[PDB]
């Protein structure tokens, strides 16, 4: 019964070596199956798109929690590593490792901030209980 | 062991930048105007929408290849929305619309239901994200 704050539409065609675009034209992407799976590579793929979206979403959640908590964040960057695995049921699944690099906090402060961000990020909430996510954080 | 692994690094906030380490994906970001930003660049909801549409289309073709089902064509639309929650902040919801050429409606529904089981995006969000699935045939 809740109203969408934002909606975006994407259309894909042409298979794993095809093409995908958002209706508003802001994202227009060629696709290719990676060399590691016997493809030609040379373009992006859904695992990269998920890794990129997750890194950016989680960085935003760190910044949001720090702003709400009045935490003295100087900078943050976010690394996501996304792996594809085969399932016993002949499907596929993702696994994820996240690594935050946070400036301005001591190591313990940063670990608590990242933990809170993990509860707020919409990607993290979308995959809870389904995807194993490993978190690490470094300060500098 | 992993079939495939990739790494992305994001920096600069909602109006920042994200890249994969192999350089195949390099993107400026922006907060959409609907959320108070300026738009003019993509965002994590569009990335998810695009990856889900491509991933689900690949799952349809994969199941069809395994089941020896001749497909004349497939295209995939995904629609991704953000909703405000009282508790956990914002939440994703998804509508998927497959367009399949060469199968009648019952055959296409069966194929799309199986694809939904195989697609890694679907299995990632299963039960946390409402996913409405529809199929049209031509
Ligand atoms: Cl759009
Ligand atoms: Cl990479």
* Domain of residue A135, CATH code: 3.30.300.20
The reply to whether A69 and A35 lie within a common domain is: no
Task: Flag whether residue B97 sits within 8 Å of chain A, measured between CB atoms.
Answer: no
Report the residue of chain B nearest A35, measured CA to CA: B4
Partner-chain contact B76 A13, CB within 8 Å: yes
Angle between helices A46-68 and B44-66 in degrees, nearest 10: 150
Q: Identify each DSSP E strand in chain A by its residue range.
A: 6-13, 19-22, 28-30, 75-86, 92-103, 133-139
Q: Where are the alpha helices (DSSP H) in A9-136?
A: 46-68, 107-118, 122-127
d(CA B23, CA A30): 14
Are B12 and B65 found together in one domain? no
Give residues after which chain A gaps, C-N over 2.5 angstroms.
none
How many domains is chain A partitioned into structurally? 2
CB B42 within 8 A of CB B29: yes
CA distances from B1 to A38, A74, B27 (A): 16, 37, 29
Nearest to B10 among A27, A29, A59 (CB): A59
Domain limits at A134? 45-140
Look up residue A115 and give its two tokens: 């933990």
Chain B CB contacts of A2 below 8 Å: 83-84
User: Is any Cβ of chain B less than 8 angstroms from the Cβ of A87?
Assistant: yes
**Of B69, B63, B93, the residue nearest B80 (C-alpha):** B93
| DSSP-assigned letter for residue B23 | S
A21 touches chain B (CB under 8 A): yes
Same domain, A5 and A56: no
Which protein residues have a CB closer than 5 Å to ligand 1 (ion)? A 8-9, 22-24
Chain B residues lying within 8 Å of A28, measured CB to CB: none
A60 shares a domain with A34: no
DSSP string, B121-132: HHHHHTTTS-EE
Q: Is A22 on the interface with B (CB under 8 A)?
A: yes
* Pairwise CB contact (< 8 Å): B9 & A119: no
**Are residues A71 and A23 located together in one domain of the fold?**
no
The coordinates were experimentally obtained by X-ray
Helices A107-118 & A46-68 angle (0-180, nearest 10): 110
Instruction: Tell me, in angstroms, the distance from the centre of ligand 1 to residue A24's CA.
Output: 4
- On whether both B31 and B96 belong to a single domain, the answer is no
Residue whose C-alpha is closest to residue B110's, from B94, B80, B133: B133
What distance separates the 2 farthest-apart alpha carbons in chain A?
A: 49
What CATH number corresponds to the domain at position A3? 2.20.25.10
Question: Same domain, yes or no, for B81 and B123?
Answer: yes
The label of the residue with tokens 């399949």 reads B100
Sheet containing A19-22, strands listed edge to edge, beginning at the edge strand earlier in sequence? A28-30, A19-22, A6-13, B73-84, B90-101, B131-137
- Distance, in Å, from the CA atom of B117 to the CA atom of B95, rounded to the nearest integer, reads 16
Question: Are B104 and B117 within one domain?
Answer: yes
Nearest chain B CA: its distance from A17 CA (Å): 10
Angle, nearest 10°, between helix axes B105-118 and B44-66? Answer: 120
Of the candidates A24, A66, A1, A65, which has an alpha carbon nearest to the alpha carbon of residue B84?
Answer: A1
Out of A29, A49, A120, name the one closest to residue B89 (CB). A120
B29 with B70, same domain: the answer is: no
Whether B78 and B116 map to the same domain: the answer is yes
Q: How many CB pairs under 8 A join A and B?
A: 267
Query: Are B78 and B24 in a shared domain?
Result: no
Residues of chain A with C-beta less than 8 angstroms from the C-beta of B34? 5-6
Residues B72-82 as b/e (b if ≥16 CB within 10 A, e otherwise) read eebbbbbbbbb
Do residues B66 and B34 both lie within one domain?
no
Tokens standing for residue B42: 């993509």
């Amino acid at each position: 019964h809740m109203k969408a704050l934002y909606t975006t539409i994407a259309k894909a065609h042409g298979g794993r070596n095809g093409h995908v675009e958002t209706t508003d034209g802001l994202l227009k992407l060629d696709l290719a199956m990676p060399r590691e799976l016997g493809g030609e590579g040379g373009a992006t793929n859904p695992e990269q798109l998920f890794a990129a979206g997750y890194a950016a979403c989680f960085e935003s959640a760190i910044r949001h929690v720090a702003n709400v908590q009045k935490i003295s964040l100087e900078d943050v960057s976010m690394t996501s590593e996304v792996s594809l695995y085969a399932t016993p049921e002949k499907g596929f699944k993702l696994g994820v490792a996240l690594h935050a690099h946070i400036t301005g906090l001591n190591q313990n402060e940063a670990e608590a901030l990242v933990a809170k961000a993990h509860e707020v990020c919409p990607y993290s909430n979308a995959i809870r209980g389904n995807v194993d996510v490993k978190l690490s954080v470094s300060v500098k």
